[PDB]
């Protein structure tokens, strides 16, 4: 299993998820089971919480390439959460058995990928951007913002999710964003 | 795998390598593959470097338990390096799949063995002791040498070989033996 | 443009918010506010017909000096999906362990 596109729309409407099982024949049998969405408030160390934010069973649809690749366009207002002040955990469970002779570790039935709205963090960093121009001084705000972002980045990439939640709460939980207007802005 | 003996010969003419595979009931299928020699100039962290000092393949020598024990006596002057001022790194590879009952952590195919010449350190200690014999005062250089050797030992035992090369080249490189 | 409008509204609203909280704003920044809204009315009026693309380049590159100059004016954020180093998601699929006369091949 792997992630193709895991992102929040820059208009702060849609939590975009696009999962697809690996194309290698080892994993031909394995199929996607469900999509579970958790936030920093409903996160548990192992597996999804027993009180998630959204559940989506793949098998309640056409049942095989359609089953191997799934995509969602969840609107965030139906989830009753803030697009910018929330950090989502996307769990994908697979149903099946990978054929033997696959190297171990590749046969991980569960995969986890997080999500954050980077636009408000860029909005904060732009305030200190011009410190880079001014020589004779350390751009301390720019450095602080970069390190704040990379703390979350590294803690995510190493699997140290609890400290990642702690840093997100310390830094970015008070982020603000322009709520998208329900009347669709018409253009094309 | 493990090393039986790994030293430079007392005559300062041979670099002795004697390797053996562990006697374990789950290492029958494991043999020896090759011996790669590197110096402090060509050493790289991720496995043996390219353009190594001396590549040795074990199936050339023999014509199966013979594969599980290997011994060499490499004339150092044929390797075209100084036996006094060289820090040989000896890599060994397995070419074998251990059993499925192997305990976690023992299935390491590669090993590494560091080699230095101990004569120059011995002669330096004798010089410093001779200085001590006069007026019974310890030169500070002697304590410095002891602690620098301890630093290189700690670096080697912890696997921090690049800084060990730094210390060796900076401090102990000019050696008479 | 429709964005010089937003920047100007934000800037003057922040100006009067400061004059509400405090009773003083640097006139070195009132100069920047004056330049900003003067430019926006210049570009949203009957004088937008005298501008070439070189003039557009110069105007934008001169307005970006006002971007982080004061808190009233901010760096605008556009919808961007690019970066200086992009990701390579192409996949490798050779044909039955074949090669060309010199190199590898795929589907």
């Amino acid at each position: 299993m792997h992630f193709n596109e895991l992102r929040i729309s820059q208009d702060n409407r849609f939590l975009i998820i696009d999962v697809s099982v690996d194309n290698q024949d080892y994993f031909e049998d394995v199929l996607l089971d469900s999509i579970v969405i958790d936030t920093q408030d409903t996160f548990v160390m192992n597996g999804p919480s027993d009180n998630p934010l959204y559940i989506y069973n793949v098998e309640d649809a056409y049942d095989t390439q359609q089953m191997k690749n799934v995509r969602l366009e969840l609107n965030i207002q139906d989830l009753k959460v803030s697009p910018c002040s929330t950090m989502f955990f996307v769990y994908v469970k697979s149903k099946g058995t990978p054929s033997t002779d696959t190297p171990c570790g590749f046969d991980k039935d569960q995969i986890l990928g997080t999500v954050i709205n980077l636009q408000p963090i860029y909005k904060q960093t732009l305030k200190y951007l011009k410190e880079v121009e001014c020589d004779c001084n350390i751009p301390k705000g720019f450095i602080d913002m970069i390190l704040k972002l990379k703390a979350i980045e590294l803690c995510v990439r190493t699997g140290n999710y609890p400290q990642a939640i702690k840093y997100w709460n310390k830094f970015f939980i008070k982020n603000n964003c322009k709520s998208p207007t329900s009347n669709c802005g018409c253009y094309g | 795998m493990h090393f039986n003996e790994l030293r430079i010969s007392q005559d300062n003419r041979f670099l002795i390598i004697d390797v053996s595979v562990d006697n374990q009931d789950y290492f029958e299928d494991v043999l020896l593959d090759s011996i790669v020699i590197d110096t402090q100039d060509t050493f790289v962290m991720n496995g043996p470097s390219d353009n190594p000092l001396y590549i040795y393949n074990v199936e050339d020598a023999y014509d199966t338990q013979q594969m599980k024990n290997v011994r060499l006596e490499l004339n150092i002057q044929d390797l075209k390096v100084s036996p006094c001022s060289t820090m040989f790194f000896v890599y060994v590879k397995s070419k074998g799949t251990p059993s499925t009952d192997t305990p976690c952590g023992f299935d390491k195919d590669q090993i590494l063995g560091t080699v230095i010449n101990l004569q120059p350190i011995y002669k330096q200690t004798l010089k410093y002791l001779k200085e001590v014999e006069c007026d019974c005062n310890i030169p500070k250089g002697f304590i410095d040498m002891i602690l620098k050797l301890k630093a290189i030992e700690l670096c080697v035992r912890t696997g921090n070989y690049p800084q060990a090369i730094k210390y060796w080249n900076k401090f102990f490189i000019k050696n008479n033996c | 443009m429709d964005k010089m409008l937003e920047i100007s509204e934000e800037a003057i609203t922040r100006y009067f918010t400061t004059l509400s909280q405090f009773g003083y704003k640097k006139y070195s920044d009132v100069d920047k506010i004056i330049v900003l809204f003067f430019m926006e009315e210049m570009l949203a009026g009957e004088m937008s017909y005298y501008v070439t693309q070189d003039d557009y380049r110069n105007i934008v590159n001169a307005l970006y000096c006002l971007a982080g100059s004061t808190c009233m004016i901010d760096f605008p954020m556009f919808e961007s999906y690019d970066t200086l180093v992009h990701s390579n998601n192409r996949t490798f699929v050779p044909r039955i362990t074949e090669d060309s006369i010199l190199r590898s091949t795929e589907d």
């Binding site: 290698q24 024949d25 | 090759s34 790669v36 496995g47 390219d50 590879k93 | 996949t91 699929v93 050779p94």
Partner: peptide, 19 residues
């Protein structure tokens, strides 16, 4: 690195999988 032969065989095996 040396890349003894079974590593090359592993690389072949993986690459030839989605071949």
């Amino acid at each position: 690195m040396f890349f003894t032969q079974e590593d090359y065989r592993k690389i072949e095996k993986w690459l030839l999988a989605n071949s």
